[PDB]
């Protein structure tokens, strides 16, 4: 009923390993770019 | 190079500019650098040198940016930073 049984699991192992690598790396790339905004500081200086 | 040569000599025109170049140069270089030396320094600059020196200071380096006024359109820093390469 499922001749692809063993192959999908071997692939699934590779998918999990690749995601274990790519997810935190892309997340690191996301935080790198966003750091410009996350640490930005604002100040309001109206005339008075 | 020609623009720079002309700026250097035309700036040192009159006693005040020359006097200032003397006072400030002794404090900055520790000596007065003569025009003939500036000429030698300028003469040796060619396209290769300009590329290498510009790359060293401008290429993929983080800039410092200051804006004032109607600056809604001043690019985001990340975009400015990517413009450096």
């Amino acid at each position: 009923a499922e001749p692809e049984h063993d192959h999908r699991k071997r692939m699934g192992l590779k998918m999990l390993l690749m995601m274990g690598l790519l997810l935190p790396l892309v997340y690191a790339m996301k935080r790198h770019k966003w750091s410009v905004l996350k640490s930005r500081k604002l100040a309001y200086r109206p005339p008075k | 190079k020609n623009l720079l040569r002309n700026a250097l000599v035309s700036h040192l025109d009159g006693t005040t500019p020359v006097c200032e170049d003397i006072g400030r140069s002794l404090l900055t270089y520790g000596r007065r650098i003569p025009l003939a030396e500036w000429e030698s320094r300028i003469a040796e600059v060619d396209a290769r040198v300009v590329r290498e020196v510009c790359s060293k200071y401008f290429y993929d380096q983080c800039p410092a940016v200051a804006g004032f006024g109607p600056i809604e359109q001043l690019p985001d820093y990340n975009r400015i930073r990517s413009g450096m390469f």
Binding site: - | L4, N6, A7, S10
Partner: protein, 42 residues
């Protein structure tokens, strides 16, 4: 030429000190350049 003008044009005073020197004293002169900001003296 090579030297940029003291003040580049486009299109603050609140004290005596900053005001001294503002009064004109000689006829007007207008300059126009190829490479340098225009000026008007006096």
């Amino acid at each position: 030429a090579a030297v940029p003008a003291t003040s580049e044009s486009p299109v603050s005073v609140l004290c005596r000190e900053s005001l001294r020197g503002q009064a004109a004293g000689r006829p007007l002169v207008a300059s126009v350049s190829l490479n340098v900001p225009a000026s008007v003296r006096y």
